[PDB]
Amino acid sequence: PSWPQILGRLTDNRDLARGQAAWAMDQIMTGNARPAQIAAFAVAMTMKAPTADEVGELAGVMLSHAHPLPADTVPDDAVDVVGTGGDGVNTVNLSTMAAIVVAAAGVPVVKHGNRAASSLSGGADTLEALGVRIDLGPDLVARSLAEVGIGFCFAPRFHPSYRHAAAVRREIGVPTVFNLLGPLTNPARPRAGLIGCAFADLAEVMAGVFAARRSSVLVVHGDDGLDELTTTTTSTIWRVAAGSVDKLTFDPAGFGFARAQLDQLAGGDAQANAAAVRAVLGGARGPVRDAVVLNAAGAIVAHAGLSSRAEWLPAWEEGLRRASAAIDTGAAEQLLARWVRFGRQI
Amino acid sequence: PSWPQILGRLTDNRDLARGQAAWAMDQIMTGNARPAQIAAFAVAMTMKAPTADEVGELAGVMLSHAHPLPADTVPDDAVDVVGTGGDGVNTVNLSTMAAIVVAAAGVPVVKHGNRAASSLSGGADTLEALGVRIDLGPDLVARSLAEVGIGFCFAPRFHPSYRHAAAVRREIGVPTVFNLLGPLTNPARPRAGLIGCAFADLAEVMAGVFAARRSSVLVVHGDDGLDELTTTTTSTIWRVAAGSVDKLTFDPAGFGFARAQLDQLAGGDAQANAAAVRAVLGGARGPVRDAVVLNAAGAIVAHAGLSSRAEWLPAWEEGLRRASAAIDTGAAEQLLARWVRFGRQI
Ligand SMILES: O=P(O)(O)OC[C@H]1O[C@H](OP(=O)(O)OP(=O)(O)O)[C@H](O)[C@@H]1O
Ligand SMILES: O=P(O)(O)OC[C@H]1O[C@H](OP(=O)(O)OP(=O)(O)O)[C@H](O)[C@@H]1O
Ligand SMILES: O=C(O)c1ccccc1O
Ligand SMILES: O=C(O)c1ccccc1O
Ligand SMILES: [Mg+2]
Ligand SMILES: [Mg+2]
Ligand SMILES: [Mg+2]
Ligand SMILES: [Mg+2]
Numbered sequence: 001p002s003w004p005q006i007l008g009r010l011t012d013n014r015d016l017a018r019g020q021a022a023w024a025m026d027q028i029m030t031g032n033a034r035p036a037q038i039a040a041f042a043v044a045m046t047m048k049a050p051t052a053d054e055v056g057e058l059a060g061v062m063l064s065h066a067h068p069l070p071a072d073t074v075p076d077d078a079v080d081v082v083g084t085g086g087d088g089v090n091t092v093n094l095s096t097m098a099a100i101v102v103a104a105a106g107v108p109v110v111k112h113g114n115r116a117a118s119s120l121s122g123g124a125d126t127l128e129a130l131g132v133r134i135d136l137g138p139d140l141v142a143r144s145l146a147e148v149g150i151g152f153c154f155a156p157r158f159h160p161s162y163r164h165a166a167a168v169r170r171e172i173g174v175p176t177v178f179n180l181l182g183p184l185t186n187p188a189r190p191r192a193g194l195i196g197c198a199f200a201d202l203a204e205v206m207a208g209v210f211a212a213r214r215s216s217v218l219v220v221h222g223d224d225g226l227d228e229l230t231t232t233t234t235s236t237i238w239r240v241a242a243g244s245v246d247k248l249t250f251d252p253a254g255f256g257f258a259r260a261q262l263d264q265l266a267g268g269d270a271q272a273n274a275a276a277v278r279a280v281l282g283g284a285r286g287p288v289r290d291a292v293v294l295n296a297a298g299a300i301v302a303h304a305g306l307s308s309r310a311e312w313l314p315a316w317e318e319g320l321r322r323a324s325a326a327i328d329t330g331a332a333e334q335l336l337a338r339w340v341r342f343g344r345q346i
Numbered sequence: 347p348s349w350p351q352i353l354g355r356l357t358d359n360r361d362l363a364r365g366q367a368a369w370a371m372d373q374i375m376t377g378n379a380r381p382a383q384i385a386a387f388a389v390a391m392t393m394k395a396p397t398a399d400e401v402g403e404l405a406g407v408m409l410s411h412a413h414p415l416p417a418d419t420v421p422d423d424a425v426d427v428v429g430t431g432g433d434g435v436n437t438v439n440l441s442t443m444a445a446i447v448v449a450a451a452g453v454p455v456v457k458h459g460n461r462a463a464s465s466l467s468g469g470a471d472t473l474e475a476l477g478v479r480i481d482l483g484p485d486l487v488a489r490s491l492a493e494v495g496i497g498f499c500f501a502p503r504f505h506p507s508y509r510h511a512a513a514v515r516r517e518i519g520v521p522t523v524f525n526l527l528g529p530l531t532n533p534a535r536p537r538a539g540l541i542g543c544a545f546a547d548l549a550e551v552m553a554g555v556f557a558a559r560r561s562s563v564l565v566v567h568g569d570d571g572l573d574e575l576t577t578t579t580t581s582t583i584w585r586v587a588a589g590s591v592d593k594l595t596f597d598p599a600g601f602g603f604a605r606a607q608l609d610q611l612a613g614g615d616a617q618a619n620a621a622a623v624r625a626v627l628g629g630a631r632g633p634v635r636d637a638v639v640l641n642a643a644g645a646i647v648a649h650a651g652l653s654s655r656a657e658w659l660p661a662w663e664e665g666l667r668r669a670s671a672a673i674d675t676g677a678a679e680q681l682l683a684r685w686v687r688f689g690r691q692i
Contacts, residue, residue, distance in 0.1 A: 003518065003519060003520075004518075004519040004520050007389075007518060007519070007520040008520045008521075011389065011392055011393055011520055011521075011522075013393075034381070034517045035380070035381045035382040035385075036381040036382060036384065036385035036514045036517040036518050037385070037517060037518055038382065039381075039382040039383070039385040039386045039389070040385045040386070040388075040389045040518045040520070042386075043353075043357065043385075043386045043389045043390050043393075044389050044393065046357055047357055047359070047389075047390065047393040047394070048393070167382075168382045171349075171380045171382040171383060172349065172350075172353060172382050172383060172386045173348075173349055173350035173353065173354075174349075174350055174353040174354045174357055174386070175354075175357075176357075
């Protein structure tokens with residue numbers, strides 16, 4: 001294989017042969033690709049329209065190179081809540097808030113995340129401002145998960161060989177297929193997830209990658225453009241269960257949610273977004289809470305799907321009940337406090 | 347303007363706004379673009395499908411930055427004979443041989459060229475092997491043109507600010523829109539040419555760029571893949587005259603040319619290809635001579651097109667007669683000897 005061969009095939013608008021995307025990603029991950037080659041590959045793949053097979057190869061290479069968690073430290077039913085980012089709408093950190101609530105409901109959460117790329121504050125930035133340690137290595141993440149019920153895998157700490165690709169992503173500035181890889185490369189490899197996709201025409205490809213792994217996952221795109229389950233309108237959901245993908249339209253009004261305006265979900269810098277986390281966890285009513293509860297419930301539904309006996313509507317009602325109770329009893333607020341203390345106590 | 351704006355527009359499969367391609371190329375020509383940005387741009391433009399407006403912007407910027415020839419040193423009727431290269435068929439240097447014969451017939455030739463990229467020996471490599479000075483500056487090319495009837499503009503000598511783009515083209519090694527720019531950026535700006543295009547679906551775009559300049563040009567693509575008029579089969583010609591483009595198919599059998607096999611046109615390293623030039627100019631009959639006479643006649647037809655009185659069949663008959671006579675009288679052989687002497691006597 002070679003760059004001229006692979007890039008030529010993509011510019012001819014042809015799908016790659018089996019193993020070609022993997023070869024490319026591995027060249028990229030070993031410091032063996034020129035920045036120009038990395039860029040051409042990212043752009044060419046994006047414009048051809050990447051297939052699930054191709055994206056799965058990219059993600060697989062990344063997972064091969066990632067720092068893994070220690071054997072037997074990740075519960076079989078661990079869940080992630082994370083999105084591509086890049087929806088362009090500056091919101092509060094919905095996935096991060098949802099993840100805390102989910103953990104507090106008793107679902108183990110190993111969250112993958114990163115700093116902002118185009119937003120004012122990313123999940124990692126907001127966690128840092130809350131006093132949560134985002135610098136933890138494999139062993140300490142495993143301990144966080146066991147002792148607190150949640151662990152945070154900071155993308156740059158677990159994927160050091162992605163350095164070169166990350167740099168090129170920053171330089172070119174446009175979204176590419178690389179923007180899909182974060183949610184697909186959690187180093188703890190959880191089998192369930194609520195996965196947000198900002199790019200409506202690539203969400204089905206992300207869902208195909210999860211289906212290949214037989215994950216129980218909801219890939220979500222709010223019909224307003226959010227990489228989260230939205231409260232402002234319907235959301236498209238690509239449901240992954242039993243190795244197949246199901247596309248459906250989701251309306252939170254069907255569960256009693258009131259239509260919000262995007263303005264109401266608006267965020268700020270790390271300090272502002274941290275304050276919004278404390279506000280929700282302290283029981284504050286309103287649009288932000290509603291959005292947090294809905295997404296927390298979505299992750300609980302994904303967790304439920306790890307069993308083939310899970311039914312859609314009863315799963316959602318249970319998810320909503322559990323998410324609401326985890327906040328209302330103060331369990332979510334206490335969990336955050338316990339998470340902060342854990343990192344301080346080394 | 348910005349890289350994210352421009353690259354995003356391209357990845358959304360949209361034509362650029364007027365001036366955006368020019369902004370991009372200017373950034374690239376001023377050393378202000380990262381290699382990743384250069385590559386993303388070249389690739390994204392290629393996969394979107396470039397327009398003549400866009401390619402015309404890129405070439406315009408390059409021509410802005412190029413060393414010009416001194417005022418009033420290029421005859422109004424000078425012609426170029428040059429191709430994109432990249433046909434991936436190792437042939438003798440047909441454009442370069444054609445250019446010598448055309449100059450010997452008395453049509454002023456200011457030829458743009460470069461060393462090999464893909465092939466064993468490019469036009470510049472073969473001229474060097476023949477003893478021709480290939481890297482003369484503006485004043486000396488002007489003198490060569492006046493005194494010998496032909497001048498050669500070496501792309502790296504006249505387009506020094508293209509070095510970063512050139513480097514990226516080499517690194518990524520798949521053709522992009524940049525592969526079109528050589529024949530479109532002759533620094534002497536001759537108004538006529540025989541212009542080869544290896545890429546069947548980009549030839550019409552090249553022709554549109556020349557149309558916008560009101561050049562008299564035949565853009566040619568051999569139906570066997572050659573970026574020259576072939577003798578093995580038909581060629582597609584995009585004829586540019588009076589600011590418009592006419593698509594034609596051309597069959598040299600209509601002018602008495604026997605079919606050749608492509609291996610009959612095969613070349614080798616610069617020494618071999620130099621020997622091939624000497625063989626044709628010394629009156630050797632055979633397939634190489636036929637392909638040379640045909641291409642020289644094409645260039646003479648383009649020159650004739652600078653008049654609105656030019657008629658297609660008479661022009662080809664005159665071109666063929668003039669090209670053959672220039673070889674047979676020994677004028678083409680003598681012009682090469684004189685060109686070699688000129689460079690030695692500077
Ligand atoms: O700056 P952007 O490109 O828009 O990305 C915003 C955030 O979205 C992703 O994380 P995640 O879903 O985990 O964070 P969230 O809590 O902000 O939803 C990404 O890692 C960023 O942290
Ligand atoms: O290595 P490649 O990418 O295939 O390019 C082969 C040659 O074709 C172009 O020139 P030109 O048309 O002047 O050369 P020619 O005499 O070989 O036809 C290009 O400048 C190279 O010199
Ligand atoms: O975004 C990443 O995952 C990353 C990884 C390694 C180095 C820098 C980075 O931004
Ligand atoms: O090929 C070119 O035009 C070129 C131009 C400047 C520097 C190096 C180069 O190869
Ligand atoms: Mg999110
Ligand atoms: Mg989001
Ligand atoms: Mg040529
Ligand atoms: Mg050629």
